[PDB]
Amino acid sequence: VVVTTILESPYVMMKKNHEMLEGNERYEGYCVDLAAEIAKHCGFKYKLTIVGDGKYGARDADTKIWNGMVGELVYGKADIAIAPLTITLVREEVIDFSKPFMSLGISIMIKKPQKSKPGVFSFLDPLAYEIWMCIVFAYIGVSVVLFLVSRFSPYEFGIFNSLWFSLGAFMRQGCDISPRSLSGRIVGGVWWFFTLIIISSYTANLAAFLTVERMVSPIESAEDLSKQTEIAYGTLDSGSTKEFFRRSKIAVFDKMWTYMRSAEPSVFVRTTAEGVARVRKSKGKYAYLLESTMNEYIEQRKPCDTMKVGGNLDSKGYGIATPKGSSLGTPVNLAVLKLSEQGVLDKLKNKWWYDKGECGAKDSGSKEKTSALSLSNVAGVFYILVGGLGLAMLVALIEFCYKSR
Amino acid sequence: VVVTTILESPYVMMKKNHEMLEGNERYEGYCVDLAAEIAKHCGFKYKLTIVGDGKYGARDADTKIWNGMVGELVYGKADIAIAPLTITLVREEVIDFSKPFMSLGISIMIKKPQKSKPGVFSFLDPLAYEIWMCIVFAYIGVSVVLFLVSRFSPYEFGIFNSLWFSLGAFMRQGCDISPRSLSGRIVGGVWWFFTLIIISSYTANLAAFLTVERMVSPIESAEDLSKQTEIAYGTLDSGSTKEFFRRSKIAVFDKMWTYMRSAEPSVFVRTTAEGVARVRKSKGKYAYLLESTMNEYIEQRKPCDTMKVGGNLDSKGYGIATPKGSSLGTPVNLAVLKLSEQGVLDKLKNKWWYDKGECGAKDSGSKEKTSALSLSNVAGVFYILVGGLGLAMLVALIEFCYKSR
Amino acid sequence: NRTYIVTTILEDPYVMLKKNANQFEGNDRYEGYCVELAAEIAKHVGYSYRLEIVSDGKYGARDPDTKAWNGMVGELVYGRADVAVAPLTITLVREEVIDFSKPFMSLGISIMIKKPQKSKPGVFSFLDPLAYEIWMCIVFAYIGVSVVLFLVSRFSPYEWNEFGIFNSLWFSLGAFMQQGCDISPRSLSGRIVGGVWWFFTLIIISSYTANLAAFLTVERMVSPIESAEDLAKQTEIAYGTLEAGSTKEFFRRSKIAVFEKMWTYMKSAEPSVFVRTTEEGMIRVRKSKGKYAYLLESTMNEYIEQRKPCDTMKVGGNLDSKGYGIATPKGSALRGPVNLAVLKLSEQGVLDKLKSKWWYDKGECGSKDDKTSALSLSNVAGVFYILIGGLGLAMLVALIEFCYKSR
Amino acid sequence: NRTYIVTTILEDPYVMLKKNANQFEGNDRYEGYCVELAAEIAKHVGYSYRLEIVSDGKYGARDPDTKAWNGMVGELVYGRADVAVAPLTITLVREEVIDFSKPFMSLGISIMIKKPQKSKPGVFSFLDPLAYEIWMCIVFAYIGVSVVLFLVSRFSPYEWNEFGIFNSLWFSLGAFMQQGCDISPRSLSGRIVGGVWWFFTLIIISSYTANLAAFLTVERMVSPIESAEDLAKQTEIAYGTLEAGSTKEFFRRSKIAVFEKMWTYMKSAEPSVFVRTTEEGMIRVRKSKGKYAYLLESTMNEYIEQRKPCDTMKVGGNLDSKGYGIATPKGSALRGPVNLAVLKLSEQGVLDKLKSKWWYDKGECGSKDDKTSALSLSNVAGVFYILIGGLGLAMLVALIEFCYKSR
Amino acid sequence: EKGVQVLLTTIGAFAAFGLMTIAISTDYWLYTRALICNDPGGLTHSGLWRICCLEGLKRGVCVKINHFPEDTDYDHDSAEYLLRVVRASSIFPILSAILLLLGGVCVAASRVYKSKRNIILGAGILFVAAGLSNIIGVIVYISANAGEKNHYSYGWSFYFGGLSFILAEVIGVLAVNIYIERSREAH
Amino acid sequence: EKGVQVLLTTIGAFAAFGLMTIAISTDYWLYTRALICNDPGGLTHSGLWRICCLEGLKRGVCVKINHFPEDTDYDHDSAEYLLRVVRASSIFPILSAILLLLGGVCVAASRVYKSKRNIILGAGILFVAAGLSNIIGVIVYISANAGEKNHYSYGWSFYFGGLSFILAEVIGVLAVNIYIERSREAH
Numbered sequence A, B: 001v002v003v004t005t006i007l008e009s010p011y012v013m014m015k016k017n018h019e020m021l022e023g024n025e026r027y028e029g030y031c032v033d034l035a036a037e038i039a040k041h042c043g044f045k046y047k048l049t050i051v052g053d054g055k056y057g058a059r060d061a062d063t064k065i066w067n068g069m070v071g072e073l074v075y076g077k078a079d080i081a082i083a084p085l086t087i088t089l090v091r092e093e094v095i096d097f098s099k100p101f102m103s104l105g106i107s108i109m110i111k112k113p114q115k116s117k118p119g120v121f122s123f124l125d126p127l128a129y130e131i132w133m134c135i136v137f138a139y140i141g142v143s144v145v146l147f148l149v150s151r152f153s154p155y156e157f158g159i160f161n162s163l164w165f166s167l168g169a170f171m172r173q174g175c176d177i178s179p180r181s182l183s184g185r186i187v188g189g190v191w192w193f194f195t196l197i198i199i200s201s202y203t204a205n206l207a208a209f210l211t212v213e214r215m216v217s218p219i220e221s222a223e224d225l226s227k228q229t230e231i232a233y234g235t236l237d238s239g240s241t242k243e244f245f246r247r248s249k250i251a252v253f254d255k256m257w258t259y260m261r262s263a264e265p266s267v268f269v270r271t272t273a274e275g276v277a278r279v280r281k282s283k284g285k286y287a288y289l290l291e292s293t294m295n296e297y298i299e300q301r302k303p304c305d306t307m308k309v310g311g312n313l314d315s316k317g318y319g320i321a322t323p324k325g326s327s328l329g330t331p332v333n334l335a336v337l338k339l340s341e342q343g344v345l346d347k348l349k350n351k352w353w354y355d356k357g358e359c360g361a362k363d364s365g366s367k368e369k370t371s372a373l374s375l376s377n378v379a380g381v382f383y384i385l386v387g388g389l390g391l392a393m394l395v396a397l398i399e400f401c402y403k404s405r
Numbered sequence C, D: 001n002r003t004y005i006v007t008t009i010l011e012d013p014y015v016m017l018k019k020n021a022n023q024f025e026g027n028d029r030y031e032g033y034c035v036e037l038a039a040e041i042a043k044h045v046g047y048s049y050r051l052e053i054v055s056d057g058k059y060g061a062r063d064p065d066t067k068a069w070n071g072m073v074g075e076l077v078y079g080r081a082d083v084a085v086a087p088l089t090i091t092l093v094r095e096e097v098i099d100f101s102k103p104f105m106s107l108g109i110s111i112m113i114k115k116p117q118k119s120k121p122g123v124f125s126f127l128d129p130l131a132y133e134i135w136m137c138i139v140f141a142y143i144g145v146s147v148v149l150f151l152v153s154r155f156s157p158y159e160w161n162e163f164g165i166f167n168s169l170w171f172s173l174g175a176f177m178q179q180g181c182d183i184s185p186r187s188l189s190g191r192i193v194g195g196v197w198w199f200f201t202l203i204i205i206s207s208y209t210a211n212l213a214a215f216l217t218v219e220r221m222v223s224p225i226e227s228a229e230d231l232a233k234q235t236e237i238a239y240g241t242l243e244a245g246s247t248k249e250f251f252r253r254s255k256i257a258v259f260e261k262m263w264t265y266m267k268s269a270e271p272s273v274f275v276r277t278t279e280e281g282m283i284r285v286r287k288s289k290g291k292y293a294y295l296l297e298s299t300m301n302e303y304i305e306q307r308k309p310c311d312t313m314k315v316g317g318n319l320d321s322k323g324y325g326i327a328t329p330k331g332s333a334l335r336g337p338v339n340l341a342v343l344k345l346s347e348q349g350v351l352d353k354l355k356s357k358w359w360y361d362k363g364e365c366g367s368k369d370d371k372t373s374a375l376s377l378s379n380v381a382g383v384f385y386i387l388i389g390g391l392g393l394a395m396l397v398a399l400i401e402f403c404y405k406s407r
Numbered sequence E, F: 001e002k003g004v005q006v007l008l009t010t011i012g013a014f015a016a017f018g019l020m021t022i023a024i025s026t027d028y029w030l031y032t033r034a035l036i037c038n039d040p041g042g043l044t045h046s047g048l049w050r051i052c053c054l055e056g057l058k059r060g061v062c063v064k065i066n067h068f069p070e071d072t073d074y075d076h077d078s079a080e081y082l083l084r085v086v087r088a089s090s091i092f093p094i095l096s097a098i099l100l101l102l103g104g105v106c107v108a109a110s111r112v113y114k115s116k117r118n119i120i121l122g123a124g125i126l127f128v129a130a131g132l133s134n135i136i137g138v139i140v141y142i143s144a145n146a147g148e149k150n151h152y153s154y155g156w157s158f159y160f161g162g163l164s165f166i167l168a169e170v171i172g173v174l175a176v177n178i179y180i181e182r183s184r185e186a187h
C-alpha cells in the first residue's frame, strides 16, 4: 500500500527535524496520523508519498485526463489517497470514496473586533438619543408650564428666566430665584427629581461602559451580510466557492453573486493568503468566504486577528479514496466509522486545531487594566463649548447693532 | 492473600448496590482501587475483608495486646492491611510498612465566609477612618482660616457663618454668601476642589464595594490563630492531634494546648461530626483541627459550608502494612512507588475528592445578581438624623431658657 | 420494471401524515422531506415506488441474544423491503450489514435552552436600587425634618421669621435634590438640622448612584454559555438528555474530559436530569426558565425552534458529527445510482432548498433576524410619567388659585 | 566499633561550609540541617561517623549504556561509603538497589513568583482617571470662558455690571465645582456661556467619577493565580522550569490534562521559558516583574523566600508528593535502627524544629505576618497638600492686603 | 379660629394615642413564613410581641417570641445585642404613645390656666418627639426583621403606627401655631 | 494709565503673533518614535507640517507628512476625514495668528482717528476669537495624534502656542478695559 497526500497544513506539514532521522516522520499532519490509524486497523503497509503535481484532482475537458491524486488512483500509481479531498459526483464515478471523516462547509471570516476609535459625541452613548430628545422636550414643556402658571397665578418667572431656572436645575448649578407659589414649587420639585434620576443614570451607565468592554460583531450570519453593502465579500478566484455561488439558485447566494460580480475593486483574490491579508488590514471592511476547517486553523494562529462568524453555507465532507475494485475500500469505510464512534477524530481535531493554539482559549485575558480617558473621548464637548462662546459673542454684537440703530 | 481494611469514606464505603450482585464490589473506596492495582502489580489474590473491631491499631498497656488491624497482621488473621493507617514508631516495631502513598498532616477547618450582616455606620466603609478624621480637621482649619483672613482683610464671614459656608460647600448644597476678597475666594475654591474629589471617591469606591464581593478569611495560618482568642479551637477528644499538642514543645502549639486546656466550654468533642457541626453552626467562631484528607473530603460535600485554611502543622503518611518476614512487602514497596511516579495515586485523589464533588470548582458561580440596598445598610444615617433633630430641639430650648432669664 | 417497497418512519418533518389522510391513497397520502427526496431519487434513477412504513415504528437495532434486527434494517436484510429513506443514522453495526449512501444531511449533538425573552424593564424600575422601605422612610424623615425646622425657627417670641412650614418643606426638598433654595437657616438649631439633613442626602444619593452602577455593570458582564465548556465548568444550569439512546452512549463511551464531566454530572443528578421523550425535555426546559438545558439531535432543535410556541433556542456548534443516509441491502443494484443521485442533488442545491422549505418556510415562528446596552426610554419612563403628572397637578392648582382669590 | 563514612552533598541549607573552613577540621568543619540530623541519628543508634562528601557533587543517577551509578548511590552500592544523609529523593530505581529509610521530610513541585510589593499609590493619583491633557485644556477653557463672559457682559455703553473679570473667574470656578455663586448672568450671551459651561462640567465630573469607579472595580476583581489551574488556563504569565531534571520528566510523563497543557506550553515556548540553574530562574522571575513563574522543589522555594533580597513568594499547595530519606546499602545492619530513629525524631518534633531553625530562624527576611480596599490617606494625599498650599497662599495674600491699603 | 384649632389638636392627640396603642397591641404587623408552623414554612401573621399562626390545627393558638435565638455576650456583645434589646422592649413606640398622652394632657389642661402659654409649646415638643421616636421604632423593627427568595408583607397595625406619626406631626404644627397666635395677642 | 495700556496691548499683540508664527514654523512640537527612522522605532522631533528625525545618518534630513495614510471617502467619509483635513490644513492656528495681526493693526490705527472707539472693541473681539481658535487647534492636534506602552513629549513650539493664547486673552481684556474707559470719558 502506497498512500498519497498533499501539502496543506495541518493535514500535511514537513517535520521541523526532517533533515535528521527523516524515516517516515519527515511528513507530519492530521492525515498522517489518520493514515497510521486506518492502516493499523486494516493491517497494511504504507510509505507516505506526495503527488508531484500539487494540484487537486480534476480532468481537462479538452483532454479528458485527470490532474492530481485522482490520476494516481485511476492510473494505479497510488493505492490510496488520504488528503483533504472533498467528495464529489465526478470523482465518485471513477473511484470509491469512504464515509466522511471531516464534515465542513463554506464559512465566513472577518477582522476580530477591537476597541473602536472613540468618536466625537460619544459622551451621549450611555443614553439613547430618544432619551435626550425627550429631555429637551421636557425642558421646554416644564419651562412653558412655569411661565404660564406664574403669569396666571402670581404669589419674575417670565419665559426667559423660566428656561434659565430649568436649565440651572438640570445642571445642579442652583438658581438665582425660586418659585413662591405652590404650583411653581410642585413643578420645580418634580423637575429636580427628574434631573437627579437622569444624572445618576448617566453616571452609572458610563461607569458600566468603562468597566466592562463588550465588542459586538456587526454580522452574525450570511443573510445579515447580504442585507447591507458596507462590507466586502471575498472568494479565491479559482475555487469551488466561486462555482457554488455561480450555479446557485437560492435568493441570498444569487444576490451575493450579483454583488461580487458588479463590485469594484476586484473582490476576488488569487490566493487565500491575499484574502486573509485584506481582511486583516482592511480594518473590518472585508469578509472572506472559505472552507471552515482552514478558517478554524487560521483563527488559532498568530497574530490571532480573525474569527469565524456564523454557521456554514453548505455541507461537504473530506473522504478517503480508493481505486475501483480494491479491497481496502471496505476496511477503510469501516475504520473511519470506528474512529468516529470511539472519538479519535475529535481528539485529532483538538490536537491540530485547538491544542497547538498560537492563540489562547475563547477568553485568554480579562479585566484589562483600564485606560485613563483621553481627549478624543471628550473632545466633542470642548467643540460645543467653543461654538457656544462664539455664538454668544455673535449674539452680543447683534444686540449691540440692533440697539445702537 | 487476604486484605484488611476499615470503614472510612472515601477509603471504604459499601456500594449503593451491595444487596444485588455483591461479589467483590460490595465494598468501594480509594483503598479498594489501590489494593486492586497493587495486587495486579504483584499478581496476588485478594478477597476484601473488614476487621470486626472497627478500632484502629493500638496496644493495651495493662494487657500488652494489640487492638485492630495490627492484631490481625501480627497474629496472622490477615496477610496485609490497606487502610488509612498512619506510619508510627510503635507499629513499625512489629510490622513493616511501605513508603507512603498519601502524605498529609494536621490542618484547620472553619466556616466558609459569607456575606456579613451589614452593621450601622457601614456607610463610612469606603473611606478609611483616618480620611474622615482628616476631613474634619480640614473643615475646622479652612473655616478658621476664612474667619481670620476675613476679619483682618475685609473687602459677614464670622466663625459661625464660616463653618456654615464650609459645611454647605462639602455637601454641594450651595451658599447663602460668597467671599469677595481674593484670599477668601482662593480658600473657597480649594475647599471646593477638595470636596469634589472626596465625594467622587466615596461614590466610586462604594460602587466597587457593591459590584464585586470579596469575603476574606479572618485567619490564614495557625500562628495567626494563636495570636488572637476570639475564635475557638477543636480536637477530637481521643485522637492523635490531642496527644501531638500535649507532647509538643514548640511555642505556638504549647500556647494552643494551654488555651485548649484552660478554655470553657469544652472545646473537645467525642466525634468529628460534632466538631464539624459546631463549626457549621457557630457562624465562624469555631475552628476544628483534624487531618487534611478528611477536611478536603468534607469541603467537597454538601452543604459546602467549610473550607481548609492554611498549610499543615505536621507531616504524616498513610502506609500499607505487611507482617514481618513476608514476601509481599518488597513488591508493594515497589508498587506504591510505581503508582506515584506514573500518576495513579493523583488520579485517584482527584477521583474520590475533587470529582464526585457535591460542591463545584473553586468558583462555581460569579456575578451574583446584585441586591437592592436594604434599610440595614443605611440605618445609621437615619439614627444620626434623628439624633441631630433631638439635639437641635434641645439647643433651641436651652437658648430659650437662657434668653428669657 | 417493477415497483420498490421503500421503507420510512413517521418522524416529523421527515415524513408526515397529510392534512386529510382518509381522502388520499398511495404515495400521495404522505408529505415531508423524505417523500420529496424519494421522488427526486426515483426521477434520477428511473423507477416506481410503492411507499410504505415500518410497523414497529423503530429504527434499526439488534437484540443481542436474539441477534435479530428491529426496524428498517430488519425490513431490509430479511428482504421485506428494498429501500429505506429516513433519518437512518450511519453507524458501524448498520453499515456492516447494509449499504449506506453518502450522507444527504449532516448533524450532531446540540443544545436547547429557553429563548431569551425580550426583557420588560418595568415602569418604576429606577427605584430598584433602593428598597421601597428606604424611600418611604425618606419621605417620613423629610416631613419630620420640615416640622422640626419650623418649630425651632418659629418657637420664640423674640421674632414675634421666613421659615414657615411651607418654606421649611421647600428647603428640605431642595436639600434632598442637591439644589438649594434662596433661604437658609441663620440660627444654630436650623443649621444643625440642615447639616444633618445634608449629610443624609449625600449618603443616600451616593448609594443610589453606586448601586445603580453595580446593577448595570453586572447586567453588562453576563455571558450566555454559547458552548459546552461554558455549560461544563458552570454548575448552576442543568443539562440533561434522554434516559436511553445514542446521546447517553456517546457520553458513556466519551474519552474526552468535557463530556466525561457531563456524564458524571448526569449520573450524579439530583433530581434525575434525564427524561423519557423529547417532548418531556422540551416542556421541562420551557417551564424551568433557563435552569435546564436539553441535548438532542440538532435537527429536532431547529424544527422545535421553528414551532409554536417559539420559545426555544439553539446555542453552540454541534458537539459531534454524524450523518443520515439512504440505505439499501447488501449486494443490491441501487447503491451506485442512489449515491450518484444524492451527490448530484446536494451539489445542485436541492437538499438545502427542501430543508429551508420544511424547517423555515413551513415555520410558524417566522423569525429570521441591537446589543447597545444604552439606557432606553423604558428604563426611565416612570419618572417621565411622574413629570407629566406633576405638571398637570400644577396647572390644576393654578386654576384653583385663579378661582380662589376672587375677592 | 568502628567509624562510618557518611556521604552528603553541599546543597544549602542541608549541608553548608562553616563561616571559617580553614580553622576547623573533621565533622565540625560543616554545618547544616543534615549534619545535625546525622548527629541525632548517631546518638540514637550509638556509633561514630567520619563525615564526607561525594566528589562528583551529584545525586544518584545511572548512565544507561555504562549501567553505572553517578553519585551517592554509586558511593554506596559499590561499598565506597556506608550511609547517605542528604536530600536524596525516593525513587523507584534508587529503591531497587538500596535501602531507603522512611521520609524525614516531604515536599513537591511548587510555584515561585515575584512577591507582591507594597503598592505605592502615588501622590497626585487622583488625576489618573483623566489625562493631563484634559486637565490643562480644562484650565484654558476656564480662562477663555471667563474672558468671554467679561466681554459680553461689559462691552456695551448702556451699562456705562457686576460681571467683571474677577467675578467672571469666580463664577466659572464655582460652576465647574458644581457649587454656584451669588451672581448669575441676566443677559442672553452670559446665559448661553453659563449653560454651555455647565454642560461641560456635568460631562466632565460624570466622566471622572465613572472612570474612577472603573479603576477601583477592576483593581478589586484581580485574582492572583493561587494555584496551577489559574496558571494553566491563563496564558499571559510565563511558567518555566529547568531544562533538564525531574520536573521536566514529571511533565513529560504527565497523564493529567493540566500538566499536559503546561508541557505543551513549555515545548511551544517563545522565547525558551526553561533555564539552566535555579539561580537563573530566580533572577528571571525577579526581573520579569511578575510576567514569569518558576516551578521547583518547594524547599528551595521556602529557603529563597527567606533569602536576601526577600522579593519572592510561594503560591499554592505542592503539585505532587515526594520524599527525601536516609539511604543505606542493600543488606546492611542500619536500615532498622535508622528508620526507627527517623520516626522517633519526627514524632517528638525534632525535624520541624530544625526546619524552622534553618529556614526561618536563620532567615534574613524575618517576615512572618489588611485587604480592606477602602480608600487610604495615600490615595488622596495630593488634594490635602493642595489644600494646605492654598490656605497658606491665602494667609500670605492676607498679609499683603494688610500691608497694602496703608493710606 | 382658635378654639377650633385647640379642639382639633386634642382630637388628633387622642386619635394618635389610640392608633399607636392598638398598633402595639394587635400583632398584625407582618405576614410571612416562619418554619414554626407545620418546606419554606407555614403562613403567619406576626406582630410586635407575639408571632402567631393561621395554618393547620395550630390556627388561633400562638405564643411569644424570644428575640435572642442564638448566643451572644450578655453584658456587652455588639450593636446587634443593643438592637435586639431595643426591638424586644419596643420602648420607642411606647415612649411615643406616652409622649402623645402627655401632650394631650398638657393641651387639655391649657383650657384652665389660660394665662400660661408654654403649655402648648410643651405639648408641641412632646408630639414632635413622639414622631421621631415612632420613626426610629419602625426603623429598628425593619432592621431587626432581616435574615442576613422569601416574601413578606405588612398589616394594618403598621399603617396605624404610621398614621399616628403623621397625626403627631400635624398636631405639633397646630400647637406651635396656637402658641404663636397667643404670643401675638401679647402686644 | 491709558497710553501705557495701549502700548502693552500693542506689544502683547505683536509678541503673540510672533510666538504663534514661529510655533507653526519650527516643527519642534512633539517627541516620539516613528518607525520611519531605522523595533519600536527611532527618535524624532515631529512638528505641525513635517516630521523630522534625529537618529542615524538620516539626522538633519526630513520630509513632509501625509495625514491620509489609509483610504477613506474623498467627498464625504466621516468625522475622521474632516478631522484629518483640519489637522493637515492647520487653519485654526493660522486663523488665530491672522486675527492677532488684525487686532494689532486695529489698535495701532486707533492712535489715528482717536475719536472712534469701536476700533478697540473690534481688536478685543479679534484677540478673544484668536484664543478660541488656538485652543481648538491644540485640541484637534492632540486628538489627531492618537493611535487608537509608547511614550511622547511636547516641545517649546507647543508651549509657545499656549503662551500666544494667554497673551491673546490678556490683550483682549486690556482692550475691553480701554474701550470702557473711553466710553466713560463720554459723560
Ligand SMILES: O=C1Cc2cc(-c3c(-c4ccc(F)cc4)nn4c(N5CCC(O)CC5)nccc34)ccc2N1
Binding pocket: C132, C133, C134, C136, C137, C140, E093, E134, E135, E137, E138, E142, E153, E154, E158, E159, E160, E161, E162, E163, E165
Ligand atoms: O409605628 C410606625 C409604623 C410605621 C410605618 C411606616 C411605613 C409606611 C406607611 C405607614 C402608614 C401610612 F399611612 C402609609 C405608609 N410604609 N412603609 C414602608 N413601605 C410602604 C409599603 C411597603 O409594602 C413597602 C415599603 N417601609 C417601611 C416603613 C413604612 C412609617 C412610619 C411608621 N411608624
